[PDB]
Design a protein around this ligand. Structure first.
Ligand SMILES: [Cl-]
Length: 293
């Protein structure tokens, strides 16, 4: 049974006038491993991966501003807002060198930070990550109509904010196995107050699809170009059929990105951590040792 509990003491740090919650376990010395979640999750999504890494490495898993147990100010929650809070979170923890383990919008944060701080990144493990989607054809057919509807103001906000469809519908449809009721309640908990669902709606409207929004496309293109030229060790997890990363794209990146190891997790959609956490956690732990310190 994939574990449903969240046995991590809460930690908080002041970041630009707000508090961010984070997991912090494992030994204090050595290179820390920074786990970055995306939409509509929290550090909860890493709960069954962290235990594989924490014996040998510090594990830091923040909740993005507006999400999880972090503070939820009255922001637009643009990607830019997440960048500012995460930059300040990393500095507030005094993090020097890090290994990144990143997913969905957390991977946009992680790659963008790595591009700007390349000397401080000792490895990146990533999965179902944000890349430019050049045409709506390159978005999975089964979720095309709904994400197109999410990317409207009136219909999209009614779906995501008023009716909480990204939590109640999109999130379970991002996992091959059924999420249990205990798991759904952990994911529901940050968003019981409808006004707090703003990040859940802004995030899909930030996705770089068919050239829009132009500012996000540009940013993502820039860090994908950095990633293609960087020698940083890379570990890419992928599933079948995937959502953001179909198997063919994973196979292409395994050869185009330098020093990149790709791992097939089996059946998977977006939240690969919920379908095969033991493989993801085991492989991260073993790969960390191959980085050799
Ligand atoms: Cl999204």
């Amino acid at each position: 049974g994939i574990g449903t509990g969240f046995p991590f003491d809460p930690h908080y740090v002041e970041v630009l006038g707000e508090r961010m919650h984070y997991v912090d376990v494992g030994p204090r010395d050595g290179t820390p491993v920074l786990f970055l979640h995306g939409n509509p999750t929290s550090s909860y999504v890493w709960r069954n991966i962290i235990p594989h890494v924490a014996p040998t490495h510090r594990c830091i898993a923040p909740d993005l501003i507006g999400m999880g147990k972090s503070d939820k100010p009255d922001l637009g929650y643009f990607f830019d807002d997440h960048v500012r809070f995460m930059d300040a979170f990393i500095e507030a923890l005094g993090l020097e060198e890090v290994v990144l383990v990143i997913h969905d919008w957390g991977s946009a944060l992680g790659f963008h930070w790595a591009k700007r701080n390349p000397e401080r990144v000792k490895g990146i493990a990533f999965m179902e990550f944000i890349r430019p989607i050049p045409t709506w054809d390159e978005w999975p057919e089964f979720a095309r109509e709904t994400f197109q509807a999410f990317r409207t103001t009136d219909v999209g906000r009614k779906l995501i904010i008023d009716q909480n469809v990204f939590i109640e519908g999109t999130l379970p449809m991002g996992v091959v196995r059924p999420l249990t009721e205990v798991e759904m309640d952990h994911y529901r908990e940050p968003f019981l107050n409808p006004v707090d669902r703003e990040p859940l709606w802004r995030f899909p409207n930030e996705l770089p699809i068919a050239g829009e929004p132009a500012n996000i496309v540009a940013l993502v293109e820039e860090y994908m170009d950095w990633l293609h030229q960087s020698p940083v060790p890379k570990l890419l997890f992928w599933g079948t059929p995937g959502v953001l990363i179909p198997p063919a794209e994973a196979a292409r990146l395994a050869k185009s990105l330098p020093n990149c190891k790709a791992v097939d997790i089996g059946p998977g959609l977006n939240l690969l951590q919920e379908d095969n956490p033991d493989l993801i956690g085991s492989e991260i732990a073993r790969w960390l040792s191959t980085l050799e310190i």
